[PDB]
Symmetry: none
C-alpha cells in the first residue's frame, strides 16, 4: 500500500519470451525505482473489454520517458515479439492490489 506511478502494458497474448521479458521489466522497476514505479500487465485476450478507467496510448511517445532498460524491453515486446498494443502511466494508490513476479493484479 503506497501511491506510485503504474506503467500499464496492454498486450494481446504472450510467448515464453514475452513473459520472461515482463518479469525482467517488473524486476528492474522494483529494484531501480523501489516505489517510484510499478508494473501492471493487461492481457486483452483474457479481457477483451477495457475497464472504463483504462486507456491505451502508443508506445513511441510515452516509452521515451521511461528508464533506458525499460525502453529496451518494451522495444523488444512490440517490435520483436509483437504482443504489445500500447501502454499508459498512471499515478495511483497500490495496496488492495496484488503482487507477483508479473507486476500487479
Amino acid at each position: 500500500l503506497r501511491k506510485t506511478y503504474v506503467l500499464k502494458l496492454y498486450v494481446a497474448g504472450n510467448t515464453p519470451n514475452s513473459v520472461r521479458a515482463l518479469k525482467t521489466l517488473n524486476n528492474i522497476l522494483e529494484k531501480e525505482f523501489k516505489g517510484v514505479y510499478a508494473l501492471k500487465v493487461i492481457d486483452v485476450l483474457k479481457n477483451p473489454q477495457l475497464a472504463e478507467e483504462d486507456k491505451i496510448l502508443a508506445t513511441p511517445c510515452l516509452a521515451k520517458v521511461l528508464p533506458p532498460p525499460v525502453r529496451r524491453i518494451i522495444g523488444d515486446l512490440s517490435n520483436r515479439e509483437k504482443v504489445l498494443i500500447g501502454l499508459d502511466l498512471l499515478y495511483e494508490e497500490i495496496g488492495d492490489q496484488a503482487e507477483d513476479d508479473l507486476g500487479l493484479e
Copy 2:
C-alpha cells in the same frame, strides 16, 4: 469534415461481422457524410501506431447516436470483441 469512428476489436465472430456491416450501413444511409467507420483487429494487428490510441467504450459510446451505440453495446456485451474506441474529427486522409 468527418467524424472517423475507430473500433478496436479482439478478432471476429459470425455475429460480430453481422453487427459491423449493419453498423457501417447505418452510417452510410442514415448519417451520410457524418461518420466514417474504421475497424482495427488487434488479434490480427496488435501494434498501435503513434497518433493512435484506444479510449473507453462507455465514454465515447455516449456522444454517438442511439442506434450506433446499440451496436457498440452489442459488440461489447453480446459478442465481446470490442476492446475500445477512438473518435476523430477532421478532413479525410484516405477514405477507402
Copy 3:
C-alpha cells in the same frame, strides 16, 4: 457531472494571446467532442506546487493523439507564446467541478 477525458495543460503565466487561444481550445473541444473531452488549465505561477494527483508530460508525444485543431493551438502556445510546459490526458469524473470559458476549475 459526467466521466470524460480531461486534457490538462500546464502553463507558467499567460499573455492576452495565450488566454484567447485557450478559450478557443476550450470552445473547439466542447463543440467538436461534446463530452469526449474537456480542458483544464493549470497555471504553475499561481500554484508552484503540483497537486500530488498531477503529472506533466512533454507536448510532442501526447499532442499527436489530439484533434488537429487542438495540435495547432497547442503548437502556438508552446512554440510561439511559450507559456506551455507540458500536458496530460486523464479520464475522470466531472461534476463537483466548475465551468467557465477557460475550461475546468
Copy 4:
C-alpha cells in the same frame, strides 16, 4: 550508473538558492557518485523536452534519503518554488 535527480522550480529566492547548494553538497560529499543534481527553472525555461516529464514531489521524495527529502520538503513548503521532480537511473550523458 547514476541516479539523476531533476528538480523543476518556479524561479529562485535567496533561501531557495541556499537550500539548493547545500543539497548539491549533500550529494557530492555524502552520496558521492550515487546522485547527480539537475535543476530546471521553469519560470526561465517553460518548454519541456520530449524525454522529459515532471512527477509529483510527494511520491519521488520518498525513495530519496532523509536529508535530501528534508531540503525537498523545504523547497516545496518553505520556499515554495518546487513544482515537482524527476528521477532517472542511467549512465551519464553530460555530467557537467
